[PDB]
């Protein structure tokens, strides 16, 4: 049927539109991360984290929508080889972007730890390298440098929660093949 054909292709086009939309958000997040690691004023850092929090929020919403639409498209192609192939192709591209997001947040977590460590040597010049690593790795023990250590410490906790969300989403999409 003609109308049955463009209906499924409308689903694929919508998914592919949200896929590229999702890819842009992920790259904007990566860029906000690297800008936040520069010397910025208090008002400039607040503006950057405003956009970053918005981008993070958009990413979570698009992940819900892509999860539902890709699963729904896969069910429409259970006995149609052409429909199954397109939906599977959408599923693989979604997973690659989830992998990009995970790796992007992984890089930011390391560089945020390295910044928190170097910032801990200022607040405690006598502290040794091991005492610095142990302090940053939560928890045991919590100047402009002090507030940043507490801030990046609370940020590492939210990065780990986001990466746990991506792992769960990643496995939710693998229970489809």
């Amino acid at each position: 049927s003609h109308m049955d054909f463009v209906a499924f292709m409308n689903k694929i086009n919508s998914i592919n539109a949200n896929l590229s939309r999702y890819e842009n958000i992920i790259n904007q997040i990566d860029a906000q991360h690297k800008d936040l690691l520069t010397q910025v004023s208090e008002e400039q850092e607040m503006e950057l984290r405003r956009s970053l929090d918005d981008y993070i929020s958009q990413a979570t919403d698009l992940q819900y929508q892509l999860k539902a639409d890709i699963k729904d498209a896969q069910r429409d192609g259970l006995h149609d080889s052409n429909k199954q192939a397109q939906a599977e192709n959408c599923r693989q591209k979604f997973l690659k972007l989830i992998q990009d997001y995970r790796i992007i947040d992984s890089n930011y977590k390391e560089e945020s730890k390295e910044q928190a460590k170097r910032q801990y040597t200022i607040i405690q010049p006598e502290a040794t390298d091991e005492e610095v690593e142990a302090a940053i790795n939560d928890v045991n023990g919590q100047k402009t440098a002090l507030a940043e250590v507490q801030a990046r410490h609370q940020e590492l906790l939210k990065l780990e929660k986001t990466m746990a969300e991506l792992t769960q989403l990643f496995n939710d999409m693998e229970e489809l093949v």
Partner: protein
């Protein structure tokens, strides 16, 4: 017809019953994740065996991935065998953090090399079984070590939902 998947379930149930069901002396047993059947050459354990290696050298073994019960981030790799009475038994264990390099044999569809402290050459029974298991091994690594991967040699990066760009940002090297 559908023997591969059905035998995988028998192996899974038997591996769990023999190896991941009784507690130690004294955490509970590890949690099974996946496995694959492998061929190990006893004379050529660390490199591709030459074609004229006699069949007596070929030993039936299995690789098993599991997780510690109270820490799903501590994954272990096991090499197991089937005893004469049919019981499965684990003979060698690595920590997943020991995995440094994973290489695909360009000439043998079933062969691969895992590098911990030593290099280990193994072969799956079929080409598809190498693809599925190595995908499970690498996927579990990225998930376990927060977006990191070991060195990958001669694999299609899209198998692990990676590209050259994301691989370079994630590799431990």
């Amino acid at each position: 017809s559908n023997f591969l998947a059905e035998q995988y379930e028998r192996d899974r149930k038997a591996i769990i019953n023999c190896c991941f069901s009784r507690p130690d002396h004294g955490e509970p047993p590890n949690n099974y994740i996946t496995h694959v059947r492998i061929i190990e050459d006893s004379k050529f354990p660390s490199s591709r065996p030459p074609p004229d290696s006699k069949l007596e050298n070929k030993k039936k073994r299995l690789l098993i991935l599991s997780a510690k019960p109270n820490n799903a981030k501590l994954i272990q790799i096991h090499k197991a065998r089937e005893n004469s009475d049919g019981s499965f038994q684990i003979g060698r264990t690595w920590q997943l953090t020991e995995l440094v390099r994973v290489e695909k044999d360009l000439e043998i569809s079933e062969g691969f090399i895992l590098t911990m402290s030593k290099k280990y050459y193994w072969e799956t029974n079929s080409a598809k079984e190498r693809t599925v298991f190595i995908k499970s091994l690498i996927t579990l690594y990225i998930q376990t070590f927060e977006g990191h991967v070991p060195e990958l040699v001669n694999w299609d990066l899209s198998l692990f939902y990676l590209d050259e760009r994301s691989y370079q940002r994630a590799v431990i090297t």
